[PDB]
Amino acid sequence: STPELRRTWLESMAKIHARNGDLSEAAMCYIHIAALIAEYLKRKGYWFSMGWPAFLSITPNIKEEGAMKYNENILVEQLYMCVEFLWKSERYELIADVNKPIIAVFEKQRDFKKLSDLYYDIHRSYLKVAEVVNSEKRLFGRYYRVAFYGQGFFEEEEGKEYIYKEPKLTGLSEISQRLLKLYADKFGADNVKIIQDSNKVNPKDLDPKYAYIQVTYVTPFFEEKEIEDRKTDFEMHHNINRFVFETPFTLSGKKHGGVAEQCKRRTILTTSHLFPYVKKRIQVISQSSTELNPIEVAIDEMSKKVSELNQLCTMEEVDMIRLQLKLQGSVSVKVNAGPMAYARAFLEETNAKKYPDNQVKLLKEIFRQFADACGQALDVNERLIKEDQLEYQEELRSHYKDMLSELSTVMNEQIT
């Protein structure tokens, strides 16, 4: 909250982030410095002139720079820094908003070569977006809920829940062992344990003689209303604060059960600030959760597989192996229970009397869509196989007919 101390910290955080490769966080450091300088330069009559609001198009987090207790040229140099790391971090869509204030400066100077350079950079940034957007080529990060427990051990983290933004495709083993290594060295490896349970930890159940770290993979969450925005791979990682995970539980009290007792909890974690931020972890301030019935779990997983199958078929160039993976995994299940375990548990006349009519009717309709989705995937595979998968395709077809016939008995209805 005191300008020079905040600005020094932001710069050192930027340098650290750059060494660590958290390039988005470096870029956010420089925009927060630029917003800091602009509010300071405003508060002391200097005459964008709005102060920190000048960079809201980049991120709303800069609102916190307005709790403060340096010339125009160095402000422009923080934005140069900011653009540099926006480039490296592949957040190209933001370079324009960051260069617009700089262009204003050089319009006044009549520096036409600089104006050519700046407009050219923005052109290049949008050219990159056009040739890369929505291609799964950009790896903006994986997210993890991390909670710390251990009153005798943990300092500022004790009893606190964070979302950790990890680089690229960082998997569960990577962040787990890295967090375990770091805190094992400060506390002695023999006192540090990982909580794998994704349920909210109850401290009473924990032995105080240990320090605990709870690690859970989460993904960015959006409701249908939010699908208006978030049409881009970038937009799904830009200014986000809600993350979701599901947790299994049964009707009795176990994690895992058969299909007729299997439930799940969907939990949505809301963070203190939006990612990206000047840090790669942000504290969770609230949780929202709901739970799904066994028949609601069935409905959920059946909807997903119809969408999966339908999307593979509608591709401009069908991926044959990917279609076969999902097709065989639906009509030809042999390790798991197979989708017909759901039809047995929830759609058979005698079982359907145990669930509300509207829920079984929605399940029947998704099953209809499922028969159609398998049938289409079969017809698509027929157009792609060579001689070496003729018998394979014939066996999928015979399973699909056999599944169709059993589904018809269960639903007492002609599934074609």
């Binding site: 569960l172 083993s173 859970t216 895992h256 997983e301 597989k305 993976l325 197979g338």
Partner: protein, 178 residues
């Protein structure tokens, strides 16, 4: 050339499916939601371009011996799985699994995969194995069988502790690239 086809075989109490779900959902083995469907897909990066790794799960029971090889055409790599605390599954690797895949796919590479390595350091398990006068398979033993059966490599993992999980599939991906 968008999807790698990796076929996974082994006995049914080896924990081979719980392994693929854990790695695919990026979850500890108690936290994934049970699925009724078979097979698993994950995105892997080859030189900055996005690729799909498709994991085809097979049921290892004898009742499916006639139908399982119909999944073998177009396979890039095999994963032959056994538990390190189930000697029978390890003998079935030499006796049934490498024979079956090498007969149908003589030029396709395969890895030898040890699962449940966490139980090797488990007292109760180590005693349950004592009661039948068997001891857990050691990595040197499995590496010897790997060299003898011409496997690309031997890899070990624990789906519970996540130790060596990532390396199994890093090694599968390199083998699948031929």
């Amino acid at each position: 050339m968008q999807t790698i086809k990796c076929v996974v075989v082994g006995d049914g109490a080896v924990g081979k499916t719980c392994l693929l779900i854990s790695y695919t959902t990026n979850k500890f083995p108690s936290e994934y939601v049970p699925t009724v469907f078979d097979n698993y897909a994950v995105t892997v990066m080859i030189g900055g371009e996005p690729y799909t790794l498709g994991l085809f799960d097979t049921a290892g029971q004898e009742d499916y011996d006639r139908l399982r090889p119909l999944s073998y055409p177009q396979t890039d790599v095999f994963l032959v799985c056994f538990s390190v605390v189930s000697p029978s599954s390890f003998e079935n690797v030499k006796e049934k699994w490498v024979p079956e895949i090498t007969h149908h796919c003589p030029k396709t590479p395969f890895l030898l995969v040890g699962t449940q390595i966490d139980l090797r350091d488990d007292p109760s398990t180590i005693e349950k194995l004592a009661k039948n006068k068997q001891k857990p398979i050691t990595p040197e033993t499995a590496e010897k069988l790997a060299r003898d059966l011409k496997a690309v490599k031997y890899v070990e993992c624990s789906a519970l502790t996540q130790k060596g999980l990532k390396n199994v599939f890093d090694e599968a991906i390199l083998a699948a690239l031929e």
